[PDB]
Structures are given as C-alpha cells and as structure tokens.
Design an enzyme around this catalytic site. Structure first.
Site, PDB file in Angstrom:
ATOM      1  N   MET A   1      -9.189  -3.410   8.352  1.00 15.52           N
ATOM      2  CA  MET A   1      -8.689  -3.735   9.686  1.00 15.52           C
ATOM      3  C   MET A   1      -7.956  -2.564  10.363  1.00 15.52           C
ATOM      4  O   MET A   1      -7.330  -2.762  11.403  1.00 15.52           O
ATOM      5  CB  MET A   1      -7.786  -4.981   9.586  1.00 15.52           C
ATOM      6  CG  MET A   1      -8.478  -6.191   8.962  1.00 15.52           C
ATOM      7  SD  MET A   1      -7.435  -7.646   8.741  1.00 15.52           S
ATOM      8  CE  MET A   1      -7.029  -8.048  10.425  1.00 15.52           C
ATOM      9  N   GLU A   2      -8.062  -1.354   9.799  1.00 17.17           N
ATOM     10  CA  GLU A   2      -7.288  -0.192  10.292  1.00 17.17           C
ATOM     11  C   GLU A   2      -7.984   1.179  10.305  1.00 17.17           C
ATOM     12  O   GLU A   2      -7.516   2.089  10.990  1.00 17.17           O
ATOM     13  CB  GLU A   2      -6.003  -0.034   9.482  1.00 17.17           C
ATOM     14  CG  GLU A   2      -5.076  -1.247   9.477  1.00 17.17           C
ATOM     15  CD  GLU A   2      -5.432  -2.326   8.458  1.00 17.17           C
ATOM     16  OE1 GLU A   2      -6.282  -2.113   7.552  1.00 17.17           O
ATOM     17  OE2 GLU A   2      -4.841  -3.421   8.570  1.00 17.17           O
TER      18      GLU A   2
ATOM     19  N   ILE B   1     -12.320 -10.716   6.602  1.00 19.55           N
ATOM     20  CA  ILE B   1     -13.676 -11.214   6.356  1.00 19.55           C
ATOM     21  C   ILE B   1     -13.702 -11.942   5.010  1.00 19.55           C
ATOM     22  O   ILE B   1     -13.350 -11.373   3.982  1.00 19.55           O
ATOM     23  CB  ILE B   1     -14.706 -10.069   6.368  1.00 19.55           C
ATOM     24  CG1 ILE B   1     -14.659  -9.291   7.694  1.00 19.55           C
ATOM     25  CG2 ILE B   1     -16.111 -10.578   6.097  1.00 19.55           C
ATOM     26  CD1 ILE B   1     -14.961 -10.103   8.931  1.00 19.55           C
TER      27      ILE B   1
ATOM     28  N   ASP C   1     -11.288  -7.185  -3.117  1.00 17.36           N
ATOM     29  CA  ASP C   1     -12.081  -8.413  -3.020  1.00 17.36           C
ATOM     30  C   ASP C   1     -13.483  -8.059  -2.552  1.00 17.36           C
ATOM     31  O   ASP C   1     -13.760  -6.900  -2.242  1.00 17.36           O
ATOM     32  CB  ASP C   1     -11.417  -9.423  -2.062  1.00 17.36           C
ATOM     33  CG  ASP C   1     -11.269  -8.889  -0.658  1.00 17.36           C
ATOM     34  OD1 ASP C   1     -12.208  -9.060   0.146  1.00 17.36           O
ATOM     35  OD2 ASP C   1     -10.200  -8.309  -0.346  1.00 17.36           O
TER      36      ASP C   1
ATOM     37  N   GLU D   1       0.798  -1.220   0.000  1.00 17.32           N
ATOM     38  CA  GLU D   1       0.000   0.000   0.000  1.00 17.32           C
ATOM     39  C   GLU D   1       0.842   1.286   0.000  1.00 17.32           C
ATOM     40  O   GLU D   1       0.344   2.328  -0.403  1.00 17.32           O
ATOM     41  CB  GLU D   1      -0.983  -0.029   1.180  1.00 17.32           C
ATOM     42  CG  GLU D   1      -1.981  -1.182   1.052  1.00 17.32           C
ATOM     43  CD  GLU D   1      -2.802  -1.452   2.301  1.00 17.32           C
ATOM     44  OE1 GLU D   1      -2.270  -1.300   3.419  1.00 17.32           O
ATOM     45  OE2 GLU D   1      -3.985  -1.865   2.153  1.00 17.32           O
TER      46      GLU D   1
ATOM     47  N   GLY E   1     -12.273  -4.805   1.572  1.00 20.31           N
ATOM     48  CA  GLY E   1     -13.244  -5.795   1.119  1.00 20.31           C
ATOM     49  C   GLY E   1     -14.587  -5.144   0.881  1.00 20.31           C
ATOM     50  O   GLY E   1     -15.132  -4.516   1.781  1.00 20.31           O
TER      51      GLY E   1
HETATM   52  C1  LIG Z   1      -3.737 -10.251   5.216  1.00 24.78           C
HETATM   53  C2  LIG Z   1      -4.597  -9.304   4.394  1.00 24.78           C
HETATM   54  C3  LIG Z   1      -5.421  -8.287   5.212  1.00 24.78           C
HETATM   55  C4  LIG Z   1      -4.970  -6.825   5.025  1.00 24.78           C
HETATM   56  C5  LIG Z   1      -5.677  -6.126   3.864  1.00 24.78           C
HETATM   57  N1  LIG Z   1      -6.438  -5.001   4.475  1.00 24.78           N
HETATM   58  C6  LIG Z   1      -7.666  -4.589   3.800  1.00 24.78           C
HETATM   59  C7  LIG Z   1      -8.639  -5.667   3.390  1.00 24.78           C
HETATM   60  C8  LIG Z   1      -8.912  -6.052   2.087  1.00 24.78           C
HETATM   61  N2  LIG Z   1      -9.857  -7.037   2.049  1.00 24.78           N
HETATM   62  C9  LIG Z   1     -10.273  -7.330   3.283  1.00 24.78           C
HETATM   63  C10 LIG Z   1     -11.242  -8.249   3.898  1.00 24.78           C
HETATM   64  N3  LIG Z   1     -11.980  -9.071   3.124  1.00 24.78           N
HETATM   65  N4  LIG Z   1     -11.357  -8.245   5.250  1.00 24.78           N
HETATM   66  C11 LIG Z   1     -10.630  -7.418   6.033  1.00 24.78           C
HETATM   67  N5  LIG Z   1      -9.729  -6.552   5.549  1.00 24.78           N
HETATM   68  C12 LIG Z   1      -9.536  -6.488   4.209  1.00 24.78           C
HETATM   69  C13 LIG Z   1      -6.607  -5.312   5.909  1.00 24.78           C
HETATM   70  C14 LIG Z   1      -5.273  -5.938   6.227  1.00 24.78           C
HETATM   71  O1  LIG Z   1      -4.314  -4.882   6.386  1.00 24.78           O
END
Ligand SMILES: CCC[C@H]1CN(Cc2c[nH]c3c(N)ncnc23)C[C@@H]1O
Ligand SMILES: CCC[C@H]1CN(Cc2c[nH]c3c(N)ncnc23)C[C@@H]1O
EC number: 3.2.2.30
Lengths: 229, 229
Positions: B173-174, B153, B197, B13, B79
């Site tokens: 997640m941030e 997720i 995704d 990123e 996501g």
């Molecule tokens: C190991 C990969 C997780 C990374 C990618 N980021 C964003 C993200 C994209 N798709 C997601 C989803 N489906 N669920 C949670 N988070 C995310 C959160 C974490 O820093």
C-alpha cells in the site's frame, strides 16, 4: 503578506490564474513546473499537481516544505453527488475523507487507518473568508463534505454507496490528500470545487464539455480570496 | 557519507531498526515522529509513515524536501502474488504501479495519468548493491514487480486481476507512491518487502501471525545495505 499556494490537479484548473496574473517566473521541480507571481502584494506559488492522491500529496508537500507556503488554496472541478448541485455550482469542503482507503478486513471503518481520522477538516477562518467573498460578489456557494479517491466515478451505484457511507456532497481525486498534508504541516487549507458533472452515467462526457468553464469559475473565486488575505 | 532515509509504513517495520540503533533523537513533524541516528558513521533519518499511499507520499516528501535525504530505502512486508514466493521471502521491486489509479473511463490504461507513466522504476545501482549484500550474507533475494494500492488484498479474484494486468509478484500500500516521490525529487530509491501473507482467503490472519518476523527480516537487510553505502 503571507505566502500563498494555489494548487489544481490539471492544467485547465490553473491556466486561467496564470492568464489573469500575466507575469510570473517558472521553476522546474519534482517533475513538474511551479509558478511564482506577485498578486496585489501577495507572493503566490502555483502549480497543477497532475491527477490523483499521490500527485496532489507531493505538490502540497513541495509547496509547503520546499517553497514555504503558509496558506494553501485548492481550486478545481468535481463530480456532484448532492442532487441540489448543478453543473458549475461552487462547493467548498468542510471536511474530506478517502473512500478508497480500505483496511476493513481488520474491522476498521472504511477510510480509516491507525493514527489518522476518517475525516480531515479544512481551515475555519479561510472558509469564513470564502463566505464573505461569496456574499460580497453575489456568488452562490455551498458548504459540504467531499469524498476523495483515485477513481473517476461514473456509475450511479458507486456514487450512491460513497454518498451513503460518507454523507458526501461531491467526489474528486485530490482534496482529502491535500487537506491531510496541510493539516500535518500546520498550514491553513481551503478546498474549492466547481461541479463539472454528476458522477453517474456518461459523466465522462459532461466532464469533457464543462471542465474548462467550471475550472474558470473556481479559479476566479480563489483569486478573489487572495485579495482579502 | 550520504544522508540515508529508511522508511516503513507501520511501527513493526521500523521499531526493529530503532532497537538495533539504540541511540537516536526524535523530532515531531508532519503529524508523525522522525528519528535521527548515526549507524556506523552514516547519518540516518527513519520513520514509519502510517498506512497507505497518501501517508507514505508525505513521509518520503518530508524526508527529502525537509530533512535532505539523498537516498531512500523502504523496508516492510507485502502480500505475495507469485506462487514461488513463500512467507518470509524477500522481494525487491524493479518497478511498481498503482493498480487503483483509474481514469480508464477516458481511454487510459489502468494505473496511468497524463504526465506520469504506468510503472515507476527503482534505482539500478541500489538494486545491484542489494544483490551483492544478498550474495555476501547468503540471503535469498528475488526481483519482481510490486503493485501498490490503498486496499488490503485478501481476495483471490482481486489478486489474480492485479497479477494479470501488471505482471505483479506482490502487493502492498506504499511502494509505488514512495518510488514516485523519490524519482520526482531525483533521489535513488530501493523498495524491499518480506512476504507476510499470500493476499488471498484469510490473508489477514497470516499477516497477523507473520508480520513481526517478516518485518525484522526486511529491516535487517536494509541496515546491512547502509554499511555498503
Ligand atoms: C493493516 C495491514 C496493512 C499494512 C501491511 N502492508 C503490506 C501488506 C502485507 N500484506 C498485504 C496485503 N495482502 N495487501 C496489501 N498490503 C499488504 C500494507 C499496510 O501498510
Ligand atoms: C480526468 C478526470 C479526472 C480529474 C478531474 N477531477 C475532478 C473530478 C470531476 N469529476 C469527477 C468524477 N466524476 N470522479 C472523480 N473525480 C472527478 C479529478 C481529476 O483530477
């Protein structure tokens, strides 16, 4: 004459220290109040962070990066997992993990993210100091592993799972995050918890009944540690 | 000019920005590297925090409290929950919540702890600036709610639940943790995410396939915003 941070999560965990100290100055910062006092020739900074991992991470970071704390003592209550622990018993954490940090879909162990470890250790010298204070004051003190996450645990099945995975003796919502911050910033950290409940059925009711008293027990102990620093 | 923090969670990123900037100074701090650069005569501090709420809270706190950042732009991937979002689409957060912050046993709403709110808002003026940049560069940009928690997720039932409770358009997640820090420290915050995704079955595979490209899209956009600051 090191600068000491004393941190809790809730008002109940820090108010007993403020009442014992009597004299202190308040500063508004980071949407919170930070308290400054002199205790037996130590400069103290005190606060409650508000509940959970993000809030406690922020407070620990503020106390060190903004206010220059050189040691951090965390005081509060916890949910007991080890069946030998009773309500009111003191446990210090040797190491801590985040049970709800989960990227296990990619094969990683629960609690792991790249660049970090599953467990974070607390400071050996502070832990040994706590053991000598416990011996000196005839206070029972147990060493153990604490599992941290952003849920109040009140379910026997969930408790059993977290205990199994991490060999955790207790749970709470701030320890691993605070310990991580302190380690990252090269500040010695001590995490002390008095049991308020057993983290199972009706733990919320036990917490309500015992939080005030258990919080005072932990608070007293960390203030006695400040004397020996 | 104002000192600008640009924060991501992962190397993917932030590395695109470092490669565009070419020249920068690296400083080891808080068990991480913080990068310092001049971009078209704006002082930048950049970092990837490592994954999750605690790590991102710490980095945001460091960038502001230690390094004096006056504005913070978060860039990364997410996501998608809103069915109108496709992979690669840009979403900025109007507000964010922590879906996994749970003291609901005591009657509180999910995501709520005393002293805080369920949602944290991002900066109105930065969001309006992003809209002008999107118009200027002919980039499609959507506004929405982002739900933050410490789980990846990849489960349609979990997605549906978080969407229902928080009216969330995407997850990560941030974001909520970073936005909370910035609000607490009175720093304008902007949270931008490009979809990697759809957070359902086999989201881990889509993430792997699309993270590099989606990360570049978000990274480019925040760098264009720096020009107008
Ligand atoms: C190991 C990969 C997780 C990374 C990618 N980021 C964003 C993200 C994209 N798709 C997601 C989803 N489906 N669920 C949670 N988070 C995310 C959160 C974490 O820093
Ligand atoms: C309002 C209750 C949550 C407070 C109390 N504290 C410790 C704690 C005691 N018992 C617990 C249990 N059974 N699960 C999680 N954590 C705890 C964590 C939060 O700051």
């Amino acid at each position: 004459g090191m600068k000491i941070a004393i941190l809790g999560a809730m008002s109940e965990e820090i108010t007993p220290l403020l009442e014992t100290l009597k004299d202190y100055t308040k500063i508004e910062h980071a949407n919170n109040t930070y308290y400054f006092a002199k205790y037996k020739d130590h400069e103290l900074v005190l606060a409650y962070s508000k509940i959970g991992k993000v809030n406690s991470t922020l407070s620990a970071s503020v106390m060190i990066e903004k206010f220059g704390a050189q040691v951090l003592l965390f005081t509060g209550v916890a949910g007991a997992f080890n069946p030998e622990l009773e309500i009111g018993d003191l446990l210090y954490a040797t190491k801590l993990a985040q049970y709800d940090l989960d990227i296990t879909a990619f094969g990683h162990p629960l609690g792991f993210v790249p660049g970090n470890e599953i467990f974070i250790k607390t400071d050996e010298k502070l832990n040994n100091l706590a053991l000598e204070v416990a011996k000196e004051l005839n206070i029972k003190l147990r060493a153990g592993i604490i599992a941290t996450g952003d849920e109040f645990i009140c379910d026997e099945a969930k408790k059993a799972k977290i205990r199994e995975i991490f060999n955790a003796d207790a749970c709470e919502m701030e320890g691993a995050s605070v310990a991580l911050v302190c380690d990252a910033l090269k500040v010695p950290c001590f995490i002390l918890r008095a049991m308020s409940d057993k983290a199972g059925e009706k733990a919320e009711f036990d917490f309500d009944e015992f939080v005030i008293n258990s919080a005072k027990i932990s608070a007293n102990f960390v203030l006695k540690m400040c004397e020996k620093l």
